[model samples]
Target: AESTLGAAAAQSGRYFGTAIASGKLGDSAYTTIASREFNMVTAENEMKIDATEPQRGQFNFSAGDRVYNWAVQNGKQVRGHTLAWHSQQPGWMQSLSGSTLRQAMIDHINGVMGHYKGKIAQWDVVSHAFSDDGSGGRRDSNLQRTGNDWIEVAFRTARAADPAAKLCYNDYNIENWTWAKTQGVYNMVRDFKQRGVPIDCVGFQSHFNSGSPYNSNFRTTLQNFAALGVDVAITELDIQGASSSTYAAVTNDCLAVSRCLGITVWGVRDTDSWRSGDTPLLFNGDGSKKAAYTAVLNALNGGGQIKGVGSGRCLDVPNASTTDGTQVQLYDCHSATNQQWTYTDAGELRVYGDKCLDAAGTGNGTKVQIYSCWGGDNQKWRLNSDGSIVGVQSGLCLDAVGGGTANGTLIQLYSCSNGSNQRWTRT
Candidate 1:
């Protein structure tokens, strides 16, 4: 377990799983944790990072102070919800002129973080700051008034305020195939890093379906982030589906347990979960064991050091899944561009072949194999950090050489790996 979040991960049970931590100390958390386990939990809230005005014309720390004090007395941790965000902003923030707005933003960051310098850990330094469509400054709602470059200013101002707290860029559904979104975000951070920006992390809201394209490229994307020398977190880990009656629900949740650290589920349980109306929490609505919940338990309990994840020769890289058909394939080593891979906190895996690794052999359980090819989107595959080597595109797991035998199987993406090979992992 770690102390400060910016240093290393903590002994977070349930992956920093969450409840709406309110400013007031009295809440269900006080009753639940201590009552059930005869233990008390820490006090923390993420939404208060935007407290812009303390006494009008000056900044105040009453809101932040309350949360910090709660953490000190109780044996718990506090996560600074945010330092900057496009929404949750007061009406007055937009009304200020360029110089005034910039000043206001700066004063707020310094005042808040400076007060609870060590008490708070991570801050959502900036969010939704860029156009998700990948078109730089495309008339974003927040950008329309604040301007695009304000994002850079926000990070700089935060760095000047709290040089130690980890600063983050928070966004939702960013794990997909948005080459434009990826590039745009990369540029933002790269600009900051190159220009001496004090960015410390990227918050990828682990929101995806059973097999969305975004989930597929998650590993590569996260890898790209690590290359920047910054850390990554799957902030809000919740996998939702149309109904709780199917295994299709909780697709992304399984991914979080696999690799990425800081896996925090948005809701407490199925009943308290935000998507309780649709998919239950990791459990079934009636408290029965759902597929997703069981998958999560297995992934977390078996949590181990990140292993077998590096550039190496893929035993076999097959193209397309056709019955008895020889699909595109290749054998690779770590240095080969084809072997470069990324594993996410979720149970998804990514093989960055010059082309892409795919599960094109659809339906009827057709069997295809891998062959060498240039790297491209088609060759890249997503391996869940949990355990299951699910295909990013097909939402399947890597099968064993002889098909789902035992642990340590040299797995390949298949319909499902129902074992350790597909189990997602994390701390």
Candidate 2:
């Protein structure tokens, strides 16, 4: 059987998904590709506050149901787009304030989540709550004015409504660790975990541009959030003017982190995307698979054994230890998890999901150990075309210590002479 993006992602314990509009469900060409390529689907707008409950208590699940029902029939899981957001709220919601606003927010979560209780796998409990001023401030919204704990209240209400659903705090521009808004979200998530808030995940709305600065810290940011004991997902991801390599880079970031649950491209095709003029999506206007689609599929299937050409063994973490600073070794290639390595777009050779192959020192013969990935120069690696894996900072080749071929031979950094020990291949 041919490998699809969803199938390849599932092989690595993750899901590949897309945001689908209910209106597009009528088009056979659109439905065909959506059902075949994705294992999960997010309602592009139907599940949002305005769509689900436009007028006071009047509820309308027709649009959302269409999308959800379609996904169920196709054996795809549904991620509820959102239960709360500042934008796109009905006009009636704007007049409410104080306790009324608070109750409205809670009621919205309850009513919306209650309708699709058991079907939706995850809910975006709150989104775009923070401001971008780098002050960690809340945006000026009726919800924010209700109370300081408005975000927490939304999560609690959603959790109470649908305990089975994974409640996620979704937002954009928080993919990079350097952004103050990112830090704000991080602190909030940390605080939630510390206080036992019922949050299950954090969703990064990765709306990116092709020329956007590559955040070398992207994977580290996801790993850091996952450390808070909540799953992370690339929700609403769409890259403008993106190339195949750009798409692959974002996919690789998710693959590098163990708790990164999955990625949902913002829409099915460029013309359907919210940023249609920017042409942000994996498919083209005619529903044809773009190079970005192939790139993402390839990245989902990327990680595997790093076999040393000289020793005929795979790179192994000593006794499969995950302890930081555990020096890597060469051992019999058995395709165990410890022997697996993912070469990321940030030029990091990642193992055990969160650890990067690090050159501990600057000089030749430096020990190459697995350490907590921090996007440091020493953690960056370049797998050259000639088979030599060189450290970005030290410019030294990843070497088999003493050119030994036996088991338990330690790996190190040394000058590149194109020796057999320095030559490796990803299997």
Candidate 3:
């Protein structure tokens, strides 16, 4: 799997909960990484996507060597550079005669893998060596001329050189659920499993953005992929945001894919978002955490600080804020942060952030929105023991349209109607 600083270290144990507030790699990550755990670190732009005999034999190993030593000292494992790829290959590699090239490929695979023998836990045995549809290999492609030539060499060479380490055929766009890439990946895995090729894991890159609609169908995809005997992982994951953040969306998606090793947030926080924009992965540039960050964290951690927040088809939200420009939004109702929630010491609920309660500004069904905390009755909410509260208006409980779990459902605090979905938990 491709590695980076922001990815959740599969078994490396770097920067887990104990140090979420620290922001730097600390004792927690390594102290917990016993020798039995798998570990790896990122070395950017160093490994060739496509390795050649001359290049592989004479690779500028300074960067990779440095990384290998670092991992050895830290008690982590390494994932080898790669056997072959279509990108990042040396130009001269394209010119070798087929027979000479085949030997060169074997020499390269064994040479490099041999160097890191017992050091790396896995290798991208082959990468992007084929096209998305698997119809044909790309022309001038390193593996194209080599044919299934590289495949057998990859397994034989890697195992002969580094027997313990697993081998992978890494690629991207497998999340494009509607296309051949996802299925093409399945075909590859299925074929390899049936033939007993030395494949171990599927690196499902979740470098997601708002527009990647294959998201809703992600878990189904993983289940199918894993069914082929390969462990699935959300390798190098990120979700883009603009204007307002959508933590609910990202976390819900991750929850669907948690059987995965773990979803890495492309970067733990934004400073290094690969997309170039100020994509504050989990926190804002100003150091404030985004809803998506907290949302996903809560979802993965099971009962996060911002749990039980979603759309409702019905709610008895009070039109408390007589003020204009107020709108209802789901918010933390406890001490999540002052703006995130509202409650008195005795725990009376108010519309969080702004002082607005479930008040529908002017009248019934006016969309009880958030407003500045006014001492008036309009801003008060009674979070009762059973979870349904009496909205300052008509004493109704917020209910979903028959309490369905569909997206974009409107929320309102209405009459005290008894239903199972109306009993929301605050955790």
Quick one: best lDDT, which candidate? Answer: 2
User: Of models 2 and 3, which has the larger TM-score?
Assistant: 2
Residue-level lDDT for 6 in candidate 1: 18
Q: Which residue pairs of candidate 2 clash?
A: none
Candidate 2 stretches greater than 4 Å from native: 210-212, 303-427
Which parts of model 1 have CA positions greater than 4 angstroms off? 1-15, 23-46, 49-55, 58-74, 134-147, 209-214, 242-259, 270-276, 283-291, 303-427
**Stretches of candidate 3 above 4 Å error?**
1-40, 49-56, 71-77, 94-97, 132-140, 242-259, 278-280, 283-289, 304-427
Report the candidate with higher lDDT, 2 versus 3. 2
lDDT tens digits by residue: candidate 2, 218-269 = 8889999999999999998887754556788889999989999999998887
TM-score of each predicted structure versus truth = 0.57, 0.71, 0.58
lDDT (C-alpha, whole model) for all candidates? 0.49, 0.86, 0.50
Question: What does the lDDT read for residue 35 in candidate 2?
Answer: 93
Per-residue error for 368 in candidate 1, Å, reads 40
The local distance difference test score of model 3 is: 0.50
lDDT of 3 by residue, 2-91 (tens): 122222333232322111111233434332322222244433334443432435357555555655665567654455556666566566
Candidate 1 lands at a TM-score of 0.57
